């Protein structure tokens, strides 16, 4: 099956704008993949953030946004907060089946 790859770990500082990416072994990630992003905070607390590439779920902070950057899907956090330290997973659709990336642990130092 497709392999969806994310950075294993990223470190940022408070207030920075940071982008996490999501690539596919198949080639370019396109809007036809309907990329989505999920956040796992400590104690296994999952929240959906983004779907359909760029649509923010209701109530998610506006500092989260989704896009395509080149041939990857991307999650941008505009002004990283302490509480954004979490694992971020992306997932891509192929033939009505979802494939998760391996997740990126975002460390925010401060």
């Amino acid at each position: 099956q497709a392999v969806v790859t994310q950075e294993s770990a990223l470190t940022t500082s408070p207030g920075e704008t940071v982008t996490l990416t999501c690539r596919s072994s198949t080639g370019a990630v396109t809007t036809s993949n309907y990329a989505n992003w999920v956040q796992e905070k400590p104690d296994h607390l999952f929240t959906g953030l983004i779907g359909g590439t760029n649509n923010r779920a209701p109530g998610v902070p506006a500092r989260f946004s989704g896009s395509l950057i080149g041939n990857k899907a991307a999650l941008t956090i505009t002004g990283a907060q302490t509480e954004d330290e979490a694992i971020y997973f992306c997932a891509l659709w192929y033939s009505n089946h979802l494939v998760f990336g391996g997740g990126t642990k975002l460390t925010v130092l401060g």
Binding site: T47, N55, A91, V99, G103
Partner: protein
């Protein structure tokens, strides 16, 4: 308030089967797909499949076709996942998560997970 309430941790012997549950409340059950996801350390998240609660139609990750059985019971607003012929490879935290049927593509609400351990 939307809630997805999952069942209690399981510890079972290889060869057994288990049935996990996910009771939905606070929304129209039949208007949202229910997805099931496997979390094992080092293996991120792995999609098991999804079910349409209006009719129970399923789609699986082919890796889980012969392992998982997804059902719903509409009157009790509950989704179920049975895992068969269990091995230690099945030990993981399992989650349910909803997604709207009507053309948003984000997850929003997730269950809190159920641990399964298959040993001895």
């Amino acid at each position: 308030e939307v809630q997805l309430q999952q069942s209690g941790a399981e510890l079972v012997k290889p060869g057994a089967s288990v049935k996990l549950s996910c009771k939905a409340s606070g929304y129209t059950f039949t208007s949202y797909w229910m997805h099931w996801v496997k979390q094992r350390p080092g293996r991120g998240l792995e999609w098991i499949g999804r079910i349409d609660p209006n009719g129970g139609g399923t789609k699986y990750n082919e890796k889980f076709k012969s392992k998982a059985t997804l059902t719903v019971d509409k009157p009790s607003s509950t989704a179920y996942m049975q895992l068969s012929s269990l091995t230690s490879e099945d030990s993981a935290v399992y989650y349910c998560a909803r997604m709207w049927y009507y053309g948003t593509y984000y997850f929003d609400y997730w269950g809190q997970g159920t641990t399964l351990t298959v040993s001895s």
